[PDB]
Amino acid sequence: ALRTRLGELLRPLNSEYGKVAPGWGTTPIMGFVMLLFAVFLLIILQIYNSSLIIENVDVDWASLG
Amino acid sequence: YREGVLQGLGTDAIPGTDRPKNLDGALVGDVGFDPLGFSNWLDLRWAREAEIKHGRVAMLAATGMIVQDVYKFPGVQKTFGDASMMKLHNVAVDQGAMQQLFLWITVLETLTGIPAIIQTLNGSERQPGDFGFDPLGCGRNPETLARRQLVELKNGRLAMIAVGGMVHHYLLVGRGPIEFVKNIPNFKNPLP
Amino acid sequence: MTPSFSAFINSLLAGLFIVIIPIGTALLIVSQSD
Amino acid sequence: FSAAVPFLKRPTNLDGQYIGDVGFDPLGFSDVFDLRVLREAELKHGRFAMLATLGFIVQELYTFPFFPKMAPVDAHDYFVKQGGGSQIIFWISFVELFGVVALFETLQGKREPGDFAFDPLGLAKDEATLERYRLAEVKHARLAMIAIGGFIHQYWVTKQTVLEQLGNFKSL
Amino acid sequence: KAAPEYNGPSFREGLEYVFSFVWKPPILIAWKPR
Numbered sequence: 344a345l346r347t348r349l350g351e352l353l354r355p356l357n358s359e360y361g362k363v364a365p366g367w368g369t370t371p372i373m374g375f376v377m378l379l380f381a382v383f384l385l386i387i388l389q390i391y392n393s394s395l396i397i398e399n400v401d402v403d404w405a406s407l408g
Numbered sequence: 409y410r411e412g413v414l415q416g417l418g419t420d421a422i423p424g425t426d427r428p429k430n431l432d433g434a435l436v437g438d439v440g441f442d443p444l445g446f447s448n449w450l451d452l453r454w455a456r457e458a459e460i461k462h463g464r465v466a467m468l469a470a471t472g473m474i475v476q477d478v479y480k481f482p483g484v485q486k487t488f489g490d491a492s493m494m495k496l497h498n499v500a501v502d503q504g505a506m507q508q509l510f511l512w513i514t515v516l517e518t519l520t521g522i523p524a525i526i527q528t529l530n531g532s533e534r535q536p537g538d539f540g541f542d543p544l545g546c547g548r549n550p551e552t553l554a555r556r557q558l559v560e561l562k563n564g565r566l567a568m569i570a571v572g573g574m575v576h577h578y579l580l581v582g583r584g585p586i587e588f589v590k591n592i593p594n595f596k597n598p599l600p
Numbered sequence: 601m602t603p604s605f606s607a608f609i610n611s612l613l614a615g616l617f618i619v620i621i622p623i624g625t626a627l628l629i630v631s632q633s634d
Numbered sequence: 635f636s637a638a639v640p641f642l643k644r645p646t647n648l649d650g651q652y653i654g655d656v657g658f659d660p661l662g663f664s665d666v667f668d669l670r671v672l673r674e675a676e677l678k679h680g681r682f683a684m685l686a687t688l689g690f691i692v693q694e695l696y697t698f699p700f701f702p703k704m705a706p707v708d709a710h711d712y713f714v715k716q717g718g719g720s721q722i723i724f725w726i727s728f729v730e731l732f733g734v735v736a737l738f739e740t741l742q743g744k745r746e747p748g749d750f751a752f753d754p755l756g757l758a759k760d761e762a763t764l765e766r767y768r769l770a771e772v773k774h775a776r777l778a779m780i781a782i783g784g785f786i787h788q789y790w791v792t793k794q795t796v797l798e799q800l801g802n803f804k805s806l
Numbered sequence: 807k808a809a810p811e812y813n814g815p816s817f818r819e820g821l822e823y824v825f826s827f828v829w830k831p832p833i834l835i836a837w838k839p840r
């Protein structure tokens with residue numbers, strides 16, 4: 344295996360292979376953020392789909408000017 | 409444990425059928441009415457934590473519809489028009505009062521409301537529902553506190569039913585707690 | 601808040617309280633019981 | 635057994651080593667980040683705020699003649715353009731390079747967090763007086779960080795400066 | 807007329823230290839997770 348300056352510079356970034364946090368770790372936080380992302384995607388989809396009409400959000404070409 | 413006769417073993421007076429097994433003398437105010445065995449899979453510590461907080465909101469909510477049809481504070485009258493109790497949860501969200509009663513309550517629950525359940529779930533010493541608030545020590549006297557713990561929960565178990573009733577009765581007919589007692593008939597049906 | 605936004609939020613609440621909460625309650629209640 | 639909140643347990647790493655400790659770490663920020671870095675930040679924010687609060691009060695009562703008279707927050711805008719803003723940013727940044735060197739020292743454990751060793755007028759005579767004052771600073775920084783946020787938001791709404799608003803409450 | 811021996815990092819490594827000033831300062835290490 345060749346050793347290089349860039350290889351030694353970036354070596355700690357590729358050093359902790361297989362290192363894991365115990366148990367579930369931050370899984371509830373990930374699930375909560377995924378739920379927020381799903382709600383956001385639903386909001387933007389229904390805005391584009393015109394099933395959700397917020398005020399001052401005219402989904403139309405005529406809104407360009 | 410205020411008295412075994414009021415709560416705990418031998419005080420299961422539903423035709424006993426033994427006693428919901430998880431339920432036992434230890435939990436406060438247990439007569440063993442657990443038809444659906446909720447205790448069976450559940451963490452009665454979240455279960456006990458969950459009942460007292462629903463009870464405390466309701467006794468406070470209930471004192472409220474009753475002391476609201478009977479009183480309105482300096483002002484209120486000019487704003488809020490003069491409105492029945494659900495309308496307030498629709499006008500208030502806009503006068504802004506409520507939204508600044510969800511800010512501070514959210515601040516309350518996040519900072520102290522959520523760690524305390526995790527500690528009770530974690531095996532921390534605090535009993536489900538103990539926030540250690542006893543500014544005047546009615547609690548201090550050990551004997552009376554045991555009576556209060558059975559008292560607190562029973563009134564809360566009563567209030568949650570009453571406040572649920574007050575809200576159910578008013579939408580169908582009448583206005584508020586005091587007036588619904590006031591007009592017995594389905595004679596006038598003021599709209600919500 | 602358009603009537604459309606109100607329908608959206610209540611749709612989120614109903615999905616939570618009619619689909620997610622009842623089904624999830626049942627799985628925890630029967631999983632723990634068996 | 636947190637003293638401030640009897641119910642919650644003391645967060646594990648808030649043990650009173652740093653002064654100002656009432657165990658109030660409900661959301662457990664202490665465990666995730668190094669406490670020493672956090673104390674540095676408490677005081678550094680506090681220090682800006684404890685000063686800014688003085689300024690909103692002083693800027694309102696008096697302004698130097700060469701600058702146009704403006705409300706305290708308005709100025710963030712004139713000064714972005716007169717160019718005073720850059721000067722106050724350049725210097726506060728210069729002081730901060732030394733601050734990065736100071737922090738790295740705290741992480742290596744060779745500096746008490748928040749100590750720049752500035753006591754020119756030598757007010758701190760004894761190790762107790764230091765503990766008394768050191769607590770006072772931590773309390774004022776906490777009060778001030780709250781109050782500066784207030785002075786600004788109340789102006790964003792009342793469009794009145796803090797002393798003027800106190801004089802004419804002008805309730806919403 | 808002091809003259810330190812300086813038995814230390816070669817000149818090029820020092821230029822790297824000076825470059826590491828601008829691409830690897832210790833500002834964000836302080837916020838490392840534990």
Ligand code: CLA
Binds near residue numbers: 679
């Ligand atoms: C940004 C400012 C800041 C920072 C970095 C700290 C940092 C610290 N504080 Mg201090 N503190 C502050 C502001 C701050 N505090 C203010 C304003 C108050 C007055 C309420 C206090 C009161 C206080 C006490 C009483 C104690 C501490 C303690 C501590 C230490 C451990 C707790 C911790 O990790 O907090 C981390 C804090 C943050 C990450 C900032 C919060 C950021 C959140 C996520 C955003 C929302 C915050 C929002 C303003 C609060 C909700 C308000 C709501 C209306 C939205 C740590 C050195 C403890 C100590 O001395 O231990 C050494 C201790 O006992 N603090």
Ligand code: KC2
Binds near residue numbers: 481482486503
């Ligand atoms: C601590 C007791 C107290 C409570 C719990 C309370 C709650 C609320 C709520 C519910 C959240 C609203 C919405 C509300 C609004 C107004 N209050 Mg306030 N208020 C309280 C105390 C006083 C006093 C002493 C006065 C007063 C006033 C007004 C005016 C008048 C301006 C107008 O003319 O429009 C308005 C709109 C004055 C008044 O008219 O009272 C005769 C005045 O002297 N209030 N108030």
Ligand code: KC2
Binds near residue numbers: 594
């Ligand atoms: C579990 C929830 C609940 C509770 C805890 C509860 C307690 C009490 C108490 C306290 C002990 C009294 C004194 C009382 C009195 C009356 N209740 Mg009542 N009540 C509850 C629920 C309902 C529903 C769903 C209805 C209803 C009615 C009436 C009428 C009829 C007058 C009329 O016919 O006009 C009267 C006099 C009906 C009504 O509101 O008509 C639209 C109706 O359908 N209630 N209610």
Ligand SMILES: CC1=C(C#C/C(C)=C/C=C/C(C)=C/C=C/C=C(C)/C=C/C=C(\C)C#CC2=C(C)C[C@@H](O)CC2(C)C)C(C)(C)C[C@H](O)C1
Binds near residue numbers: 685709783
């Ligand atoms: C502790 C704890 C927690 C917490 C917490 C909290 C409550 C944290 C709150 C922290 C706060 C509020 C920090 C605020 C800092 C304010 C600053 C730095 C203001 C600087 C202003 C400047 C520089 C200015 C200015 C100005 C001047 C002077 C005049 C003008 O002409 C111009 C200008 C506008 C430029 C919680 C519960 C979350 C969890 C946890 O478990 C433990």
Ligand SMILES: CC1=C(C#C/C(C)=C/C=C/C(C)=C/C=C/C=C(C)/C=C/C=C(C)/C=C/C2=C(C)CCCC2(C)C)C(C)(C)C[C@H](O)C1
Binds near residue numbers: 572576
């Ligand atoms: C603010 C807001 C609103 C709102 C709202 C609110 C506050 C709604 C709250 C409603 C509540 C609290 C309903 C609960 C009623 C009580 C019930 C069903 C239990 C009865 C007891 C039974 C059946 C048996 C008991 C018993 C047991 C267990 C068995 C044996 C015997 C016995 C003792 C009888 C809206 C939604 C209207 C919309 C508006 O835009 C804004």
Ligand SMILES: CC1=C(C#C/C(C)=C/C=C/C(C)=C/C=C/C=C(C)/C=C/C=C(C)/C=C/C2=C(C)CCCC2(C)C)C(C)(C)C[C@H](O)C1
Binds near residue numbers: 707779782
């Ligand atoms: C963007 C902008 C700028 C700006 C700006 C600035 C400086 C913005 C900064 C705003 C600040 C600092 C807001 C502070 C919020 C603090 C809160 C809510 C904490 C309160 C304390 C609590 C809740 C205590 C709770 C507690 C109490 C005692 C009891 C319970 C326990 C405990 C939790 C301890 C300009 C002005 C420069 C102009 C430019 O054109 C644009």
